[PDB]
Amino acid sequence: STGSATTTPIDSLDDAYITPVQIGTPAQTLNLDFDTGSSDLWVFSSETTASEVDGQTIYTPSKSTTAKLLSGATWSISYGDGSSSSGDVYTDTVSVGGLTVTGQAVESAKKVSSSFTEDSTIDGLLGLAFSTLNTVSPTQQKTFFDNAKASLDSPVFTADLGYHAPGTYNFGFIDTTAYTGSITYTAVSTKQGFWEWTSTGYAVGSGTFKSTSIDGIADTGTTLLYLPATVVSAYWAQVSGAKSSSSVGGYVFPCSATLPSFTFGVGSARIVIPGDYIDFGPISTGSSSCFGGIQSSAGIGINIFGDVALKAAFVVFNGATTPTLGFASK
Numbered sequence: 001s002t003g004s005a006t007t008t009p010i011d012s013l014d015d016a017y018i019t020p021v022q023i024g025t026p027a028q029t030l031n032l033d034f035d036t037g038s039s040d041l042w043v044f045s046s047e048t049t050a051s052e053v054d055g056q057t058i059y060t061p062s063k064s065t066t067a068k069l070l071s072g073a074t075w076s077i078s079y080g081d082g083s084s085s086s087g088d089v090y091t092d093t094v095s096v097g098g099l100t101v102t103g104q105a106v107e108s109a110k111k112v113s114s115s116f117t118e119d120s121t122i123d124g125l126l127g128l129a130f131s132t133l134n135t136v137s138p139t140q141q142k143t144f145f146d147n148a149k150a151s152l153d154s155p156v157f158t159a160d161l162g163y164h165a166p167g168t169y170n171f172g173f174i175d176t177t178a179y180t181g182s183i184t185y186t187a188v189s190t191k192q193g194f195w196e197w198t199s200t201g202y203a204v205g206s207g208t209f210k211s212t213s214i215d216g217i218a219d220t221g222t223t224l225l226y227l228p229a230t231v232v233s234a235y236w237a238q239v240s241g242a243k244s245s246s247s248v249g250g251y252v253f254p255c256s257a258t259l260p261s262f263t264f265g266v267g268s269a270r271i272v273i274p275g276d277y278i279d280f281g282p283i284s285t286g287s288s289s290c291f292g293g294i295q296s297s298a299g300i301g302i303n304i305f306g307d308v309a310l311k312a313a314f315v316v317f318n319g320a321t322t323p324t325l326g327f328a329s330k
């Protein structure tokens with residue numbers, strides 16, 4: 001089997017991407033944030049505290065003839081940005097782009113933090129990291145990909161995110177029309193539960209490539225590119241007027257600037273992020289100071305190849321017996 005679904009930016013800045021997902025019988029379609037940096041499929045629901053729902057579409061398990069309460073199971077997750085959610089668990093039929101999993105754990109939110117309530121465009125998360133990170137207790141649950149894998153034509157999924165445009169998540173096949181050149185594959189460590197790999201270096205604009213190992217995660221659920229302070233300083237030094245602002249929380253730059261590209265290495269291959277992809281717009285409405293899309297990872301404890309990086313590539317999440325990652329230009 002295979003599946004193919006379009007993923008759409010939630011706003012004009014590509015702050016996140018949503019993908020429609022069918023849950024239950026009859027289908028209830030929710031727009032979920034596919035997150036290769038976590039492993040829970042959770043949704044706003046008829047159980048979510050009413051004051052914490054503000055425009056999201058909800059899953060109502062009592063209206064699904066295939067929903068079953070997973071007795072005694074609860075979940076609770078906190079993310080890197082300080083947001084969180086928690087609740088109970090159902091199993092139900094879940095379909096993405098024509099690919100169906102029966103018995104998928106659907107984590108129903110009883111509580112969500114304010115940043116989830118405040119984002120009416122995201123109805124929940126669909127985790128695509130390794131199932132070892134799943135938070136369900138006392139019986140850990142599998143991701144949608146982990147449940148589908150054996151049925152897929154090939155044990156892979158691909159992320160093809162757009163810049164200010166829709167893109168595609170495919171399951172079970174590689175669309176050879178969706179990229180240029182070849183796909184370069186690189187080793188993955190699953191020890192921290194992530195799609196963790198080592199980039200071979202970087203360049204800023206037309207500058208020379210610096211060979212240096214950068215260990216980080218391929219994370220569709222993080223907006224920005226978080227890299228070591230040395231690398232980030234080298235990038236922003238090429239932008240007149242750019243500075244790190246403790247009050248704003250990162251590097252800012254004049255909105256009048258034309259940003260240089262940023263290249264990252266995948267083996268001997270190179271992925272080029274155009275400068276425009278690095279512009280996250282005014283820091284507050286009407287400001288002429290703009291927020292940068294490349295930020296320091298110092299104090300995160302890991303580098304994060306988030307959407308800014310991934311959207312410049314066609315990315316293969318290869319879930320073969322030994323997982324790997326593939327990157328192609330597009």
Ligand SMILES: NC(=[NH2+])c1ccc(C(F)(F)F)cc1
Pocket residue numbers: 035036037038079080081219220221222300302304
């Ligand atoms: N769910 C995610 N995509 C995610 C959240 C937090 C972190 C961090 F802790 F490293 F910051 C990494 C990945």
